[PDB]
Design a protein around this ligand. Structure first.
Ligand code: LDZ
Ligand code: LDZ
Lengths: 233, 239, 202, 212, 232, 233, 200, 196, 212
């Protein structure tokens, strides 16, 4: 009641309702899937068209040659975080001439996203992100939350009807490690499909694919480039 | 309406925003810390919510310095923030005085930053309690716990989280002053397993760290082999 | 100015001339260049009087707060480090050569030379000032490991006397101090007490 | 204290109907000493653009890393790689940003244009750039420019067929002009990095010059 | 610095603080402006004559520059702040461009300021609407209106303040090439428009005219009475 | 009670959702993208005969290749159209090239959500912008039309109607739009749908139409050219 | 550098050389020292190459923002004052820029000279550069407001040619532009080598 | 350098200025105007460093014009002279000083005609007649020898001519034309340029 | 530092098969006076990188504390990533340039030697931000007395063993003692290999011959 309009007010039960509310925004976004093999980390995003005459929106973004992000929630807040991530990666390659470890970038985002959750007049970030990157520690899939908490994931799905995807991923996660890129990409596409309004299919217009690996810089496959991956399901 | 800001005392002399912040720490899994003669062993019941989470996600044992380790409970985002503060306080002490910061000084300085979040309405009290532990030849083993209010005290065995009281009964049945780290690690695992409630809390990964004469005054994660022997002893003891 | 400090098994002996100078004028002929930063930590100041007095006052303040907060006697290295921090940070606005020597319960008697520029180095014996140059060969020829407080006090008195007789910017009385766990014993050598060396005749 | 130091270096770029050659000597120096004999002054910026930078090595290192970041920032906001003409314009703004503490660097951008043809741009240490067909910069610029002007521009030559420049004729000119520079410039003469930009990518060849 | 959001959206997409500002303009005196062929006329209702009040100090018609002049309805104190900002702006324009500001240039600036006060922290919208009237260098008579929202439009004739709707309805049916051919006919159009709202008639009606290449002229009370009788 | 940046229990941000309702009260503006170019049409919504219809500017030029149709609080748009024009000229000065329409739409959409009262800045915006924009232009990708909303979200739309009658013109738009449609057919389709939604009788003075074509620059149709199309309408 | 501009009955004639020099080294003989701010306004550059090119381009950016916001093309006077005010902020700092703003406005043909020193003067005939002294003589002895278009073209080419013959830092080709009421036209780019044969 | 002259009479103030703008050894303009209309009865004649004269003069002009708009009346010659002096004196010890020598001339319907001399240091002096420039050295004595407080506007133009003829004979700089204006109850009046 | 104070002399470096070796004298001079004669101008940044410094010793003492914390900060994360010898060299170039541009330089010429991924790293960084990598490095008067000898041997035999590298370093240290008036006969030799960085104590070129 009077404990759910500011992020600086603990509820009598030790809960900030404003962070819980911001976390609802991501659950109100198109489902995005992310899985990793032993060599590749793939991000599958279900783009959503506002109308039959409107492009979907662009849910997958480039941060650096080794990192890419899938978005769920407010796109404006996603762009603001994407820019912070892009600059932090540029700063790392300018000072140490080395790609920024993916794990370290996630630590920086959680620090930047926690500050607004403890200051009066400031709102939690309303974007959930699935980060895919490759490093000297192999392929990595991370999920960030508006609460400022992040998780190293073997596979994850953030967005609307994403539990259907997380059910598929939990069942098939055992075989993902030893999987070819196309087998891995098709596993992700199958899970993203499990999050589709019953009577709906994964066309080349409603799907996007981002991939990064030992020899592949983050690439966003869209339109016809997704046809190779979709053909075979 | 006396409980909406930390800049307000109730008609009874209590700041309920700080009491509410510590309710968050009591809704977290337990993190136990036991001081022996050889150093300090930290143990945490890290509940794994999703099986799609890699091992080591949401770790609650941090290295705040070469000699200091931090166990945490409550909001992990707030806890990670205070680990950054502790890491920065230790760094500036070494750059200004030129030596490893004493754990009492590190505890006192971090506790003051926590207490500064319990006086104004422009900020909310931190929703996390932590235990800082270290071991030096001159100072010996030290265990300090800090609460959301900003109170710091040194203990021989502390327990923060949802099962602090039950964990304390078990820790109080131990002669830590005479025991060594190698023997304490198994006891920490035994208590975390005995306090864990599988019926409600689903599954958990035992996280174990230590600093002592064996680690040569360096905070580190208990070697996988020693952790596995401890977990086998823990499960066997529960029988 | 001639400042000198030596370590012995249990403490440190410190020494200094007593001459302040504006050009060739002696503004003070009885100056105390041996300043106490804490109970058993003293400093031997050389260079600018205003710069050295300001930095020593600042370090005593910072060291005092640190000791009351960390309820423990201060380490000689900490005082040397705080002196180094300021003298390096303001190396371009500060002319100050300092020797931080004192006794701590953990590392014993320690002599640290924080020279001009902001550098810090531990030394068995340290010398500093304009008169330091004339006694480099002497200290290198007369210093022996295993000396005592009495032998160390004579080394400092003999060396300062030779430098005070050759440096115009050095002279007056020889102020000596011995710091050990027991306390700090201070001594002033004046007149015939100051060691003498025969001149030639040809 | 002086913030700058001449590290030596000669850069050359020649444009063709379907190619652009960016070439450089490989010897960093200071005073009468050689720092290294393998310090190429050519830097690939894109698959169709190479920059050559000579002067104060400290500034060339900083400017090259600044451009690499500015190119990535453009690709992230514009979703495309910058064209050779776009980098030439941005470099002018970057160099002028430091007009009161300038970069002691002489840069020559050589690449293929949006039409697939060679394009060379020369820059002064403060930003002034020019689309040129061939430009030599660095320690031995005044030793290499007067000949490209005659052999490539056919200047001061009467009754001579103005044949187009082949990569074959252009590469012999680049090697020959640098061999002569190695003979009379004390700051040039370790080896010659030659980067040739074509629609098939950027190929890099290294010949050898005279070690003093 | 006080940085609270005074102007914020409301369910239904309504900035009530801006709507409250327009309510203050509706409580203001009626200001009428008719754009003629060679004369722009601005007339304001002198609510109460006061009798013991110097009129030179309560004039609601001012000159932002040699070519521009404005009338206002709403808060007189907020207006003085806006008039001074626009006067300083006209001079800054002459210094950076070496030419007289255009009527719409100053209307755009006054509107942009009136708008920033509706989307800036710690500020309340200005409770005033203005009628900027002047002649562009080309010699085109110009009439513009500004709202407390920062919205501005050009008009052939308009009315602001109390009884604006009634006066504008009148000008809507009485504005024509006929009632604008003569400078006197333009002046009597503004006079009749105000007389529809003004009860006293003549005694309580200030009026000003700015012919081309001429300064703002404040018609004397006797001259106003001449037209008021002819318009009767 | 609630500050500008408070999330709803549904995680939506109240100030951003009340600014969208503010647009639903604006003059309908239609945008159609064809291979032969982009047409932008808007309803002037004149209030009185004494008003000068030319003073109502709902279609503006950001650059020779980019035009914009606005609906909602027009005064709020002025600052957004100023950013677009300066960003285009800054891109020219820095890279000597025309800015893409997506880059201009992304630059303006970034200013949205940049509001707050927690000392965010000395000249920080207090509330969201209550305006929706239809950017139409021709880049290296061809005729392009993007739509931006007060949420900071921008989308590529083939045909889009913003304003009060969007929930009706969009249905009519999705019934008459074909990728092969010509610019002339699109221009006629815009006026027909506008005449239907417009409360007043569409004439050459109560509507504004402009077009960006591959070779020609942004062109605002004059009464004479508007009259010709309205004759067929 | 040799840049001259004169206003006559048929418009304003702008001509310039093409040589850029680092020390005594002739770096370029093909530099464009006439910038086109708009289809009706052109600015010439003398002095520092980078300085003039940067500020004249920043002028073009500001002039275009004016057209978009004011829905009208800027005057030659407003453009001249903008550059003058932009450079006065850096007076006594090193900028070396001698410029002439030339265009057709609502007040007719316009010619203003702006220096980084702070000088902003309108006029009928101006010459800026190191060869300005040599150009003034030929231009002054042959100038007439009632000069026919072809004669005005010939006078400008001859004055730049004579400046390039006496000035070491002046050379290359003569780039001629004619500003008329419908905008400017680039009339020719004659090399001083070919001009030397004709004028001799 | 540039030449400024002012002669105050019983009911008028006559001012003249050279009309030449020079680059280095070349006159780039012979129709320059160094007089600025601050008000309908106030003129500021300014000479000095390039860029500093118009930047300071245009600033003082727009501020005096803002006064008339803000208050409905104009600043008096004395108030304008003092406002100018404060601004020139308040930028002297600043990092952006204006090197400008000025001559304010105006007519107050009450205090009458006034001519004010100001140097770059900002020292204000009211003078019956004053001049600025190296030519002042060769002309101030001609004014001292012939100036009488009751000089007529006709005899004032004749003395102005004597001073400018002296510049043509003894001065080493080609100052051929002079802008001549007069101020009185009826305002500022442009008179024929004295050319040689 | 605008005015260097207690300074160190030449630092040598040579890459061999399996790692790199750096050598520096244990002396800090106060303008001709050998004042501090038992100081180490070599540092173990991490297990794969070592750093030798010439110039102001207080500026080196500042770098040892800043780089020392930077390594402690990384080793507290437990991420499995560490600063490589090349990353430490990039940071030092960025630091020296940043200070030189502010006109407050760190009067220090550093030699960074490292071993990672079976690759030997040897990088040079000056106070103006000039940096390069090379098979051998010699700062100070070693640039004129030691580098010539090292470069001759590394030209005939491009790849040296650890035994050969140490022999040549000890030979170049003797020539630096015979002809550098700011040198000292006590030196430390640091070796980076797959085992980590090892620093040898006070070694002497006492193998000096004086046939006068
Ligand atoms: C550090 C103290 C122990 C002083 C000690 C130096 O080592 N003895 C000294 O003789 C030094 C010599 C120094 C210039 C090298 N003397 C000084 O530094 C003198 C001391 C003043 C009180 C007169 N300072 C000085 O010369 O400038 C301060 C000053 C200011 C006004 C008038 C005269 C002198
Ligand atoms: C606009 C200029 C080209 C006019 C000309 C003189 O007025 N400027 C110059 O001649 C300048 C300066 C000179 C006076 C010493 N000469 C120059 O060499 C300057 C920069 C050097 C001084 C580092 N400009 C330069 O080298 O390149 C200019 C350029 C611009 C476009 C294409 C080709 C060349």
């Amino acid at each position: 009641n009077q404990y759910d309009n500011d992020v600086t007010v603990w509820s009598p039960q030790g809960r900030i309702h404003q962070i819980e509310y911001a976390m609802e925004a991501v659950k109100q976004g198109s489902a995005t899937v992310g899985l990793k093999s032993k060599t590749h980390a793939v991000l599958v995003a279900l783009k959503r068209a506002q109308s039959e005459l409107a492009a979907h929106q662009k849910k997958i973004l480039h941060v650096d040659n080794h990192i890419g992000i899938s978005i769920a929630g407010l796109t404006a807040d996603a762009r603001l975080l994407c820019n912070f991530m892009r600059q932090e990666c540029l700063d790392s390659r300018f000072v140490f001439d080395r790609p920024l470890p993916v794990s370290r970038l996630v630590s920086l985002i959680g620090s930047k996203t926690q500050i607004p959750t403890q200051r009066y007049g400031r709102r939690p970030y309303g974007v959930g992100l699935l980060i895919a990157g490759y490093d000297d520690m192999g392929p990595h899939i991370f999920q960030t939350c508006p609460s400022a908490n992040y998780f190293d994931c073997r596979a994850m799905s953030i967005g609307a009807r994403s539990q259907s995807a997380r059910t598929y991923l939990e069942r098939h996660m055992s075989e993902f490690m030893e999987c070819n890129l196309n087998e891995l990409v098709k596993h992700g596409l199958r899970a993203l499909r499990e999050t589709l309004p019953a009577e709906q299919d994964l066309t080349t217009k409603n799907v996007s694919i981002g991939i990064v690996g030992k020899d592949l810089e983050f690439t966003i496959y869209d339109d016809d480039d997704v046809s190779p991956f979709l053909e075979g399901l | 309406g006396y409980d909406l800001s930390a800049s307000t005392f109730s008609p009874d002399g209590r700041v309920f925003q700080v009491e509410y912040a510590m309710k968050a720490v009591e809704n977290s899994s337990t993190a136990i810390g036991i001081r022996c003669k050889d150093g300090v062993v930290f143990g945490v019941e890290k509940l794994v919510l999703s099986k799609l989470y890699e091992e080591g996600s949401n770790k609650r044992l941090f290295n705040v310095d070469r000699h200091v380790g931090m166990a945490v409970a409550g909001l992990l985002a707030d806890a990670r923030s205070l680990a950054d503060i502790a890491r920065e306080e230790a760094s500036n002490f070494r750059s200004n005085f030129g030596y490893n910061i004493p754990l009492k000084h590190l505890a006192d300085r971090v506790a003051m930053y926590v207490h500064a979040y319990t006086l104004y309405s422009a900020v909310r009290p931190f929703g996390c309690s932590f235990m800082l532990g270290s071991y030096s030849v001159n100072d010996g083993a030290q265990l300090y716990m800090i609460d959301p209010s900003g109170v710091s005290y040194g203990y021989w065995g502390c327990a923060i989280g949802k099962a602090r009281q039950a964990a304390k009964t078990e820790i109080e049945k131990l002669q830590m002053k005479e025991m060594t780290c190698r023997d304490i690690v198994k006891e920490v695992a035994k208590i975390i397993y005995i306090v864990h409630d599988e019926v409600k809390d689903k599954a958990f990964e035992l996280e174990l760290s230590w600093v002592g004469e064996l680690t040569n005054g360096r905070h580190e994660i208990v070697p996988k082999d020693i952790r596995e022997e401890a977990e086998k002893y823990a499960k066997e003891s529960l029988k | 100015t001639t400042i000198m400090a030596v370590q012995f098994d249990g403490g440190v002996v410190l020494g200094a001339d007593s001459r302040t100078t504006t050009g060739s004028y002696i503004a003070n002929r009885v100056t105390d260049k041996l300043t106490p930063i804490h109970d058993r930590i003293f400093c031997c100041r050389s260079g600018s009087a205003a710069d050295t007095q300001a930095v020593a006052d600042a370090v005593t303040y910072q060291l005092g707060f640190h000791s009351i907060e960390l309820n423990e006697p201060p380490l000689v290295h900490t005082a040397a480090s705080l002196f180094k921090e300021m003298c390096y940070r303001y190396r371009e606005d500060l002319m100050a050569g300092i020797i931080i020597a004192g006794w701590d319960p953990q590392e014993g008697g320690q002599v640290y030379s924080v020279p001009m520029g902001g550098m810090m180095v531990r030394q068995s014996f340290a010398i500093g000032g304009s008169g330091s140059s004339y006694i480099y060969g002497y200290v290198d020829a007369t210093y022996r490991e295993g000396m005592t407080k009495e032998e160390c006090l004579q080394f400092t008195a003999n060396a300062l006397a030779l430098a005070m007789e050759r440096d115009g910017s050095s002279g007056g009385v020889i102020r000596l101090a011995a710091i050990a766990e027991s306390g700090v014993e201070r001594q002033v050598l004046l007149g015939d007490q100051i060691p003498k060396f025969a001149v030639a005749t040809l | 204290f002086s913030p700058y130091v001449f590290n030596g270096g000669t850069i050359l770029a020649i444009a063709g109907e379907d190619f652009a050659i960016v070439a450089s000597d490989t010897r960093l120096s200071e005073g009468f000493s050689i720092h290294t004999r393998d310090s190429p002054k050519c830097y690939k910026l894109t698959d169709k653009t190479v920059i050559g930078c000579s002067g104060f090595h400290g500034d060339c290192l900083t400017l090259t890393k600044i451009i690499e970041a500015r190119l990535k920032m453009y690709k992230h906001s514009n979703n495309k790689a910058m064209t050779t003409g776009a980098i030439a314009a941005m470099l002018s703004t970057i160099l002028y940003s430091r007009r009161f503490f300038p970069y002691y660097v002489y840069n020559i951008i050589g690449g293929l244009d949006e039409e697939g043809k060679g394009a060379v741009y020369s820059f002064d240490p403060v930003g002034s750039y020019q689309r040129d067909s061939f430009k030599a910069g660095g320690s031995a610029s005044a030793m290499l420019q007067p000949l490209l002007d005659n052999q490539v521009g056919f200047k001061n030559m009467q009754n001579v067929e103005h044949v187009p420049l082949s990569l074959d004729r252009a590469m012999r000119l680049v090697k020959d002009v640098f061999i002569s520079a190695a003979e009379r410039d004390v700051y040039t003469g370790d080896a010659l990095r030659i980067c040739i930009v074509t629609k098939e990518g950027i190929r890099e060849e290294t010949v050898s010059l005279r070690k003093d | 610095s006080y940085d609270r959001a005074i102007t914020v959206f409301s369910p239904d997409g309504h900035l009530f603080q801006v709507e409250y500002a327009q309510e203050a303009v509706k409580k203001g005196s009626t200001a009428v402006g008719v754009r003629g062929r060679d004369i722009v006329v601005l007339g304001v209702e002198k609510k109460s004559v006061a009798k013991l009040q110097d009129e030179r100090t309560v004039r609601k018609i001012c000159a932002l520059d040699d070519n521009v002049c404005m009338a206002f309805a709403g808060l007189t104190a907020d207006a003085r702040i806006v008039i001074n900002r626009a006067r300083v702006e006209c001079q800054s324009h002459r210094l950076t461009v070496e030419d007289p500001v255009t009527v719409e240039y100053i209307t755009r600036y006054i509107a942009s300021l009136k708008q920033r006060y509706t989307q800036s922290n710690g500020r309340r919208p200005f409770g005033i609407s203005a009628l900027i009237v002047g002649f562009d260098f080309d010699g085109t008579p110009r009439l513009y209106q500004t709202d407390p929202s920062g919205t501005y439009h050009a008009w052939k004739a308009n009315a602001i303040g109390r009884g604006a709707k009634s006066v504008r309805e009148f000008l809507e049916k009485n504005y024509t090439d006929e009632a604008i051919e003569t400078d006197d006919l333009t002046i009597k159009l503004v006079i009749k428009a105000l007389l529809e709202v003004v009860q006293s008639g003549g005694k309580n009606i200030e009026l000003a005219v700015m012919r081309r290449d001429q300064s703002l002229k404040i018609l004397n009370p006797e001259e106003i009475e001449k037209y008021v009788a002819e318009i009767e | 009670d609630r500050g500008v940046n408070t999330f709803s229990p549904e995680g939506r941000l109240f100030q951003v959702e009340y600014a969208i309702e503010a647009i639903k009260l604006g003059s309908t503006a239609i945008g159609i993208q064809t291979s032969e170019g982009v047409c932008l049409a808007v309803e002037k919504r004149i209030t009185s005969p004494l008003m000068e219809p030319s003073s109502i500017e709902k279609i503006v030029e950001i650059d020779a290749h980019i035009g914009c149709a606005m609906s909602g609080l027009i005064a709020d748009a002025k600052t957004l159209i100023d950013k677009a024009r300066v960003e285009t000229q800054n891109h020219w000065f820095t890279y000597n090239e025309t800015m893409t329409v997506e880059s201009v739409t992304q630059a303006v959409s970034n200013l949205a959500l940049q509001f707050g009262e927690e000392d965010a800045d000395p000249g920080a915006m207090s509330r969201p912008f209550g305006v929706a924009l239809l950017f139409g232009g021709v880049d290296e990708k061809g005729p392009q039309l993007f739509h931006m909303d007060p949420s900071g979200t921008f989308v590529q739309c083939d045909a889009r109607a913003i304003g009060s009658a969007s929930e009706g013109a969009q249905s009519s738009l999705q019934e008459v739009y074909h990728k092969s449609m010509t610019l002339k057919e699109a221009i006629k389709s815009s006026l027909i749908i506008l005449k239907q939604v417009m409360e007043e009788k569409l004439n050459a003075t109560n509507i504004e139409l402009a077009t960006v074509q591959p070779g020609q620059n942004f062109h605002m149709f004059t009464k004479e050219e508007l009259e010709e199309v309205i004759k067929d309408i | 550098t040799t840049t001259l501009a004169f206003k006559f009955r048929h418009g304003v004639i702008v001509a310039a050389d093409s040589r850029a020099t680092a020390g005594a080294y002739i770096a370029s003989q093909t530099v464009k020292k006439v910038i086109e701010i708009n289809p009706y306004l052109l600015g010439t550059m003398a002095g520092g190459a980078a300085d003039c090119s940067f500020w004249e381009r920043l002028l073009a950016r500001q002039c275009r923002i004016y057209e978009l916001r004011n829905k009208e093309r800027i005057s030659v006077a407003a453009a001249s004052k903008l550059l003058a005010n932009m450079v006065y902020q850096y007076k006594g700092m090193g900028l070396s820029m001698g410029t002439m703003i030339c265009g057709w406005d609502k007040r007719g043909p316009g010619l203003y000279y702006v220096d980084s020193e702070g000088n902003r003067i309108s006029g009928a005939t101006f010459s800026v550069g190191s060869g300005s002294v040599y150009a003034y003589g030929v231009m002054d002895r042959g100038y007439s407001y009632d000069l026919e278009v072809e004669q005005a073209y010939d006078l400008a080419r001859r004055a730049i040619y004579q400046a390039t013959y006496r000035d070491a830092y002046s050379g290359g080709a003569v780039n001629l532009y004619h500003v008329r009421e419908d905008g400017w036209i680039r009339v020719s780019s004659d090399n001083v080598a070919d001009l030397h044969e004709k004028y001799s | 350098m540039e030449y400024l002259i002012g002669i105050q009479g019983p009911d008028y103030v006559l001012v003249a200025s050279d009309r030449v703008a020079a680059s280095n050894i070349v006159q780039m303009k012979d129709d320059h105007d160094k007089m600025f209309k601050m008000s309908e009865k106030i003129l500021l004649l300014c000479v000095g460093e390039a860029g500093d004269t118009v930047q300071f003069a245009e600033y003082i002009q727009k501020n005096v014009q803002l006064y008339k708009m803000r208050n409905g009346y104009e600043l008096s010659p004395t108030a304008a002279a003092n406002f100018t002096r404060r601004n020139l004196a308040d930028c002297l010890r600043s990092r952006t000083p204006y090197h400008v020598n000025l001559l304010l001339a105006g007519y107050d319907e009450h205090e009458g005609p006034a001519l004010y001399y100001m140097d770059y240091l900002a020292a204000l002096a009211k003078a019956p007649f004053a001049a600025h420039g190296y030519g002042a050295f060769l002309t101030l004595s001609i004014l001292d020898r012939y100036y009488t407080p009751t000089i007529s506007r006709e005899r004032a133009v004749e003395l102005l001519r004597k001073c400018l003829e002296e510049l043509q004979k003894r001065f080493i700089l080609n100052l051929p034309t002079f802008s001549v204006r007069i101020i009185d109850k009826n305002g500022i009046h442009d008179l024929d340029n004295i050319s040689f | 530092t605008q005015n260097p104070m207690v300074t160190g002399t030449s630092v040598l470096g040579v890459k061999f098969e399996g790692g790199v070796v750096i050598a520096a004298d244990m002396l800090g001079s106060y303008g001709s006076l050998a004042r501090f004669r038992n100081i180490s101008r070599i540092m173990r940044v991490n297990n794969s990188t070592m750093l030798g410094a010439s110039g102001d010793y207080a500026d080196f003492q500042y770098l040892k504390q800043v780089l020392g914390q930077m390594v402690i900060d990384e080793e507290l994360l437990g991420d499995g990533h560490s600063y490589s010898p090349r990353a430490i060299h990039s940071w030092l170039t960025r630091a020296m340039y940043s200070r030189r541009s502010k006109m407050n330089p760190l009067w220090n010429t550093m030699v960074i030697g490292g071993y990672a991924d079976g690759e030997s790293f040897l990088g040079y960084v000056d106070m103006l931000g000039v940096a390069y990598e090379a098979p051998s490095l010699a700062t100070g008067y070693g640039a004129y007395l030691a580098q010539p000898l090292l470069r001759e041997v590394l030209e005939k035999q491009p790849v040296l063993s650890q035994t050969e590298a140490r022999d040549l370093v000890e030979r170049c240290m003797r020539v630096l003692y015979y002809r550098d008036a700011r040198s000292y006969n006590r030196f430390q030799i640091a070796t980076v290999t797959e085992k980590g960085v090892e620093i040898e104590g006070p070694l002497s070129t006492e193998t000096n011959w004086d046939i006068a």
